[PDB]
Design a protein around this nucleic acid. Structure first.
Length: 1447
DNA sequence: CGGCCGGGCGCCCGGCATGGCGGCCTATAAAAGGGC
DNA sequence: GCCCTTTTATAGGCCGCCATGCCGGGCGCCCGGCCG
């Protein structure tokens, strides 16, 4: 596949918007470089316009526009409703012909595409070559008129609308309007007249939005064509329907500037109609008022509109701002959020007008209404806008005079203070505010019922608390602005609140004090609130709060149940205990003897013991278990009440401490202040108060640093660093993972999970604000953080390793990870001045990534990912120069593991930013997908799933500006590296030109070329050539070349990448003598070891395995000794006859697949013999996971292959098998190199095949017919095989073959037929395996030399490779095996390179019996095997390799 | 005493096609309104 | 039976897969011997 096919698919399958933006940019640049092939891109991007996904259609339209923008401009001269040559002529016609399609997606795409095409190329449309210039201009006018006509017809017929949101959306209308706006830029003014007449000024409006706003400067002041549109818009504004009003308002707002400039006269009528339409209180569910107010704000922003409005109030004040803008006040509490937000934004625009008009309507009314908005709001955005408007209004009102602010809000201050300092209840027992405190927009006393009532169950407690803090900020600001002598009521209100029986009111009072302190000119002003706050934090807290009366009453009910019901059950007489106090503590008019938690403790312990002692004997035994249950329940309720009291006390203390630190108090004895603040950093579920406490600590540290005292400062910094590391998911508990080694951590009570993460959230926010405060100087001001971060990093350097570092009970094993978490936690928020510090520490983090400690590698991967995210160029230089080189180390498993986990986390954190470095990252992941370690393979697969999608973009990403010279050189060399993989072009093969090195034939040259290609990119294969082509030479050549290259590189480097690792070869016993001879005669500079030996002898060379370059071992010697052989690693691992390991269940496969090797190769001649699962078993050894698990491969390939055995060209079965073989062929294409003996050898005569058919004998026929009436299924097959036994055919064939000058081999699968002596001159030998193996060589060598022997009989399965029987020129088969490859091997005897004459093969196939099925199965297996290996060569192999590694 | 011995048997080969564990997947349960 | 919404959640059956074979045929290993 080309680059374009993968580049276009990103527009639909792109993971993020930036990836698709880069895809369209790359595609546009592609068209720029290759301007001759616009249609190739267009034909592939256009079909997305009718896709169902919205984003795909938008991206396809943008891609079409940017592709077309680079082509040259063209200048060849010098009422059915819609419900759910010119170079681009056919494209535009295809868009217009489905612009009336029923499906709305097609219309949306068509409109977008037409817009994009015409936007850049509208001028040259419609013209035809050969016509004159002027007539072509007329044709262009006709074309644009036709397009405008068709688009306007589309606009007036489409009714598709979306009502999901309040503001209805018409996608087709909007796109068609933008298409008109694109069209109308190029036409002449006559066509503009025609279109304006067509879209007559009546009420289309969305059509008007782009019929104007194009050719704007010429339409201005153009008589009727600009005078009628204002009438149309004004009529629309006054219309009844909300939809047309909203559309007209949205149509006028972008054109408001030039519609204002059109006339000064029209402004009076326009603003009159706008204010009149807004004056009428619209329907409750209408979002139109937002558009109307946006229009009002935009119109009032222009100076001439302000002049007109000032002129309008000529005879009276009716049209002045002061009387009008209160018309906006009713909509402040409208149900739809958009209307409320619009009201606030319009009021802010009006407030920021200036011009001495704002003083009119600014008064206490709007301030009180905005304060009510703050109190009763639930939406975050509207609350923020309300507080912003409040601040701007207060600042504007204080600009005139602080006294004006102080006495304007004096009328309203006390009720708003009651609202701000109001308590909060519990879910089912609210504490409602008085509705008389709220004013109406046009009334003295009051949709917001839930917030007023204080119903915490219906509106969450977070919303109530947020309203309280917002009110506190507003009231603190307004206190700060107004003069001090006027603050008597304010200060006494908050002082009385600080002593209230409630808990919430005290919190609100502290918040108001804190905000007043913050907003003051200097902190000393607010010093009158000092000692009440110190009384809050120092003096003991109240024993109760009115908010917890529900808890105490629950305790009272449970205690009463315990006292009463279970003693009635227990039969204890009256007078058992005095009755509990009826009134609970904390309630109003509760006496000093009111029920309290202390009474609950007394009854549940002392009275419980007393009553137990008072119970009669025997009845106590009956009663006690229910008494125990009731007692435990009572204790639980008491604990709940006490916990609630503790939480309220802690919150009040935290707020008081925040107030004290805010006014710059630094007590000489800071014992309780820091305690309260840190308690509110630990156990604060409310995010807002936690952030406030975080800011409090960040300011406290700075104040103490300026004071010079540092004890508590360092203590709190240490405590913050401690709390930042409490979350398990961000820093694990070392005592658990101390026992895990060489495992990827990334692949591996409910109450506490929340506490840990909230504490870590608070600490992290505190640390971030601290860093932002200190700026550049943080590394100078505070050194305790430095020690926490750094002391285990400079420790453990130079290979240092305390033995206690591995001790689960040593705290330093946890302190190491606690230290290393802070780098990730803090580096992104540090100043750039500290980037050199982290850069200087990167050499420590990289070594932590190479360290053999698993948690070291985990934390180093995380920290390197972060550092490369934020300190991009330096961190990535370190990564590419000193991590990725280590990814290939065979022995250092830690190096590879850490260096792959770093890539995992780097991708996960950087996301889209990793585009320029995928060229560095791709090759390591490709290599490690097939690594020996299981978890490295898994995470490499996950990383590759992300990198492959971005690989097509890497060829054109703009270089980052700051890349070091090393990174530019790295990018260049990696480009040249990948170019050979992703291009069919290839290089001269890899060879070492040693003087004694042997000569290579052409096919061997191609084979070593293929092996070197595999070697470079760390891919594995099968050299499945036919026997007799010399695979040993190629194998030892590539192994020696690799060993020579590594050894030479080890002299030019010091890294542990090269270690002179051994190489293992597993052969059958008979071929070791060939392997050693070939290695010695072709690679003298290689050393050889032969582990194959007696069971005891192997210990004499056990340690010699790790000391010799090439090690040779047998399959069975490896099997019996795998438990010791698995403990070594090898550079190469070669299986000489890999068809031994085809059955996955066989123990030889289980043994061989445990051989951890860097490179891995199978030599064979029949990778697939009976079933594709043989190929799966081989590739499970070569590239684990490449073809999936067992079930996946079975379902994908094997079942269709089996089902295709019986088919008659039917689409039900033939198609499935064909697709299965095609997929398996494409998947395994680059990793098999089959070359036929016919292609290589120049001297090997042809082989001919003929079948011999004969009918079954009479006696055998009768016996079979009898047997049909007559266990296991296979015994019938065996019996049929036996009774099928030809001798006349064999006799006639032998006589025809000159026997009894001509020779033959006779193969029989059945031994009992091979010894038959029927037909009573012919001398024959027998080789049936039962003969001793040594005697076989003598027999065959006797047969081979002299011509006195005419025939030689043998069974098919006798002898392995090398059983050369060359004298024969005919081969006769009498019974055929289930395996066709065994018959082919039997034919290969007497067809070797030493063969001299033509070889003819004959088969005796008796008709109407099992043998026909045998041959049918054989040809089926032959076809299935051959079709999978049909086309194998380096150049012929498809270079889409990256797209295959997806299981 | 050293060295080649036979010698046994565990391992793998291959067929068809049956029976016994599988994982996984709705379905299980509750209220209720509407219409078919 | 059919559908919509919602929080809760886990264990039976149904369709598959999957190792079962068992007669000759062979290879390779170690495990017993002895021979001049």
């Amino acid at each position: 596949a080309t680059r374009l096919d993968r580049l276009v698919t990103i527009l639909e399958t792109g993971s993020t918007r930036l990836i698709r933006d880069t895809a369209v940019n790359q595609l546009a640049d592609w068209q720029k470089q290759h301007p001759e092939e616009l249609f190739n891109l267009l034909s592939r991007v256009v079909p997305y316009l009718r896709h169902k996904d919205w984003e795909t259609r938008t991206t396809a339209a943008k891609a079409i526009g940017k592709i077309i923008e680079n082509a040259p401009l063209y200048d060849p001269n010098a009422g059915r409703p819609l419900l759910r040559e010119w170079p681009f002529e056919r494209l535009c016609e295809f868009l217009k012909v489905d612009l009336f399609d029923p499906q709305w997606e097609t219309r949306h795409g068509a409109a977008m595409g037409l817009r994009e095409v015409i936007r850049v190329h509208g001028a040259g449309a419609g013209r035809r070559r050969g016509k004159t210039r002027k007539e072509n201009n007329d044709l262009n006018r006709q074309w644009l008129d036709d397009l405008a006509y068709r688009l306007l017809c589309v606009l007036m017929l489409d009714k598709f609308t979306d009502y999901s949101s309040d503001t209805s959306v018409a996608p087709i209308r909007e796109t068609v309007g933008q298409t008109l706006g694109a069209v109308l830029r190029h036409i002449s003014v006559e066509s503009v007249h025609a279109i304006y007449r067509l879209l007559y000024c009546m009420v289309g409006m969305v059509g008007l939005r782009y019929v104007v706003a194009v050719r704007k400067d010429l339409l201005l002041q153009d008589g009727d064509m600009i005078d009628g549109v204002v009438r149309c818009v004004m009529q629309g504004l006054g219309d009844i329907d909300d939809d047309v009003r909203s559309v007209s308002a949205a149509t006028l707002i972008p054109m408001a500037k030039e519609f204002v400039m059109m006339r000064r006269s029209a402004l009076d009528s326009l603003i009159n109609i706008v204010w009149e339409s807004l004056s009428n209180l619209g329907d409750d569910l209408s979002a139109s008022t937002g558009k109307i107010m946006d229009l009002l704000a935009t119109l009032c922003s222009f100076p001439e509109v302000l002049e007109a409005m000032k002129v309008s109030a000529s005879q009276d004040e009716e049209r002045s701002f002061t009387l009008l803008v209160p018309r906006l006040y009713p909509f402040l509490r409208h149900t739809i959020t958009s209307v409320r937000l619009a009201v606030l934004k319009a009021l802010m625009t009006f407030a920021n007008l200036g011009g001495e008009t704002s003083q009119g309507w600014l008064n206490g009314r709007i301030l009180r209404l905005i304060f009510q908005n703050i109190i009763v709001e639930r939406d975050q955005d509207t609350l923020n806008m309300s507080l912003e408007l409040w601040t701007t209004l207060v600042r504007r009102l204080a600009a005139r005079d602080p006294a004006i602010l102080a006495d304007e809000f004096e009328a309203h201050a006390e009720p708003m203070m009651q609202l701000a300092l109001h308590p909060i209840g519990v879910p089912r027992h609210p504490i409602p505010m008085n509705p008389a405190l709220f004013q109406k927009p046009s009334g003295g006393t009051y949709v917001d019922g839930h917030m007023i009532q204080g119903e915490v169950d219906l509106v969450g407690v977070d919303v109530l608390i947020r309203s309280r803090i917002s009110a506190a900020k507003a009231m603190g600001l307004i206190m700060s602005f107004i003069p001090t002598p006027r603050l008597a009521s304010y200060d006494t209100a908050v002082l009385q609140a600080l002593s209230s029986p409630y808990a919430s009111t005290q919190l609100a009072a502290a918040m108001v004090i804190d905000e007043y302190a913050k907003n003051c000119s200097t902190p000393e002003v607010a010093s009158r609130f000092i000692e009440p706050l110190q009384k809050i934090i120092d003096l003991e807290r109240p024993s109760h709060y009115r908010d917890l009366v529900t808890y105490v009453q629950r305790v009272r009910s449970a205690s009463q149940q315990l006292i009463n019901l279970f003693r009635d059950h227990g039969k204890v007489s009256q007078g058992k205990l005095p009755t509990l106090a009826v009134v609970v503590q904390g309630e109003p008019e509760a006496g000093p003897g009111a029920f309290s938690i202390a009474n609950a403790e007394k009854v549940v312990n002392e009275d419980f013991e007393r009553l137990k002692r008072l119970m009669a004997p025997g009845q106590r035994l009956i009663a006690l278990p229910q008494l125990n249950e009731a007692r435990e329940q009572t204790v639980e309720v008491i604990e709940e009440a006490k916990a609630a009291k503790e939480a309220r006390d802690a919150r009040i203390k935290a707020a008081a401490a925040c107030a004290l630190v805010a006014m710059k108090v630094l007590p000489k004895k800071p014992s309780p202040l820091i305690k309260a603040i840190m308690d509110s950093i630990k156990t604060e579920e409310n995010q807002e108060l936690q952030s406030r406490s975080a800011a409090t600590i960040a300011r406290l540290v700075q104040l103490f640093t300026e004071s010079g005292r540092r004890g508590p400062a360092e203590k709190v910094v240490a405590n913050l660093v401690k709390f930042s590391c409490v979350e398990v998911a961000e820093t694990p508990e070392f005592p658990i993972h101390a026992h895990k080694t060489n495992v990827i951590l990334s692949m591996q009570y409910a109450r506490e999970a929340k506490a840990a993460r909230i504490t870590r959230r608070g600490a992290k926010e505190a640390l971030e604000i601290l860093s932002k405060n200190f700026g550049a100087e943080l590394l100078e001001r505070v050194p305790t953080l430095r020690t926490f971060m750094e002391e285990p990093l400079v420790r453990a350097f130079s290979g240092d390793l305390p033995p206690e570092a591995r001790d689960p009970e040593n705290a330093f094993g946890q302190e190491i990870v606690d230290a290393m978490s802070v780098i990730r936690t803090m580096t992104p928020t540090l100043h750039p001045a500290l980037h050199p510090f982290v850069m200087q520490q990167v050499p420590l983090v990289i070594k932590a990534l190479r360290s053999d400690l698993s948690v070291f590698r985990y934390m180093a991967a995380k920290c390197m990912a972060t550092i490369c995210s934020v300190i991009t160029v330096d961190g990535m230089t370190a990564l590419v120069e000193k991590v990725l080189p280590s990814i290939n180390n065979p022995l250092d498993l830690s190096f590879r593991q850490g260096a792959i986990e770093v890539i995992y986390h780097l991708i996960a954190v950087m996301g889209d930013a990793i585009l320029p470095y995928v060229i560095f990252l791709i090759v390591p992941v490709l290599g490690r997908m097939s690594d020996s370690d299981n978890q490295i393979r898994l995470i490499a697969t996950t990383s590759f799933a992300t990198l492959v999608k971005l690989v097509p973009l890497e060829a054109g990403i703009p270089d980052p500006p700051g890349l070091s010279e090393e990174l530019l050189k790295g990018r260049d060399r990696e480009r040249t590296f990948i170019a050979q993989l992703l291009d069919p072009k290839k290089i001269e093969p890899f060879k070492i030109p040693v003087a004694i090195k042997a000569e290579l034939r052409s096919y061997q040259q191609e084979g070593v070329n293929w092996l070197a290609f595999l070697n470079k990119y760390h891919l594995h294969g099968i050299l499945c050539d036919d026997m007799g082509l010399g695979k040993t030479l190629q194998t030892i050549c590539i192994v020696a070349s690799d060993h020579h290259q590594r050894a030479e590189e080890f002299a030019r480097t010091g890294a542990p990448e090269v270690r002179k690792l051994p190489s293992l070869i597993i052969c059958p016993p008979t071929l070791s003598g060939h392997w050693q001879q070939e290695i010695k005669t072709y690679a003298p500079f290689l050393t050889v070891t032969a582990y194959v030996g007696s069971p005891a002898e192997r210990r004499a060379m056990k340690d010699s395995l790790d000391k010799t370059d090439i090690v040779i071992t047998s399959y069975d010697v490896c099997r019996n000794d795998i438990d010791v052989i698995e403990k070594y690693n090898w550079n190469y691992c070669v299986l000489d006859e890999g068809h031994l390991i085809k059955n996955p269940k066989a123990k030889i496969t289980l043994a061989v697949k445990r051989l951890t090797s860097n490179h891995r190769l199978i030599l064979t001649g029949t990778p697939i013999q009976n079933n594709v699962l043989e190929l799966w078993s081989l590739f499970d050894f070569l590239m684990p996971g490449f073809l999936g698990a067992e079930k996946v491969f079975l379902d994908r390939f094997a079942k269709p292959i089996a089902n295709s055995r019986y088919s008659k060209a039917s689409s039900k079965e033939q198609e499935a098998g064909a697709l299965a073989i095609e997929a398996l062929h494409k998947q395994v294409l680059p990793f098999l190199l089959r070359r036929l003996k016919e292609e290589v050898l120049n001297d090997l005569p042809p082989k001919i095949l003929q079948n011999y058919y004969c009918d079954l004998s009479d006696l055998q026929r009768k016996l079979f017919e009898d047997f049909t009436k007559r266990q296991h299924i296979f015994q019938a097959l065996q019996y049929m095989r036996k009774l099928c036994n030809k001798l006349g055919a064999l006799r006639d064939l032998l006589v025809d073959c000159g026997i009894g000058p001509h020779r033959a081999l006779i193969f029989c699968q059945m031994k009992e037929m091979l010894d038959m002596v029927q037909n009573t001159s012919v001398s024959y030998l027998r080789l049936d395996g039962s003969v001793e193996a040594n005697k076989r060589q003598d027999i065959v060598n006797k047969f081979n030399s002299d011509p006195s022997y005419d025939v030689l009989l043998l069974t098919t399965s006798v002898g392995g490779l090398g059983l050369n029987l060359t004298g024969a020129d005919t081969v006769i088969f009498v019974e055929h095996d289930w395996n066709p490859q065994k018959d082919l091997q039997a034919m290969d005897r007497a067809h070797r390179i030493g063969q001299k004459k033509v070889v003819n093969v004959y088969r005796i196939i008796t008709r109407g019996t099992l043998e026909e099925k045998i041959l049918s199965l054989q040809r089926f297996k032959i076809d299935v095997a051959s079709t999978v290996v049909n086309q194998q060569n380096a150049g012929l192999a498809t270079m889409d390799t990256d797209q295959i590694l997806d299981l």
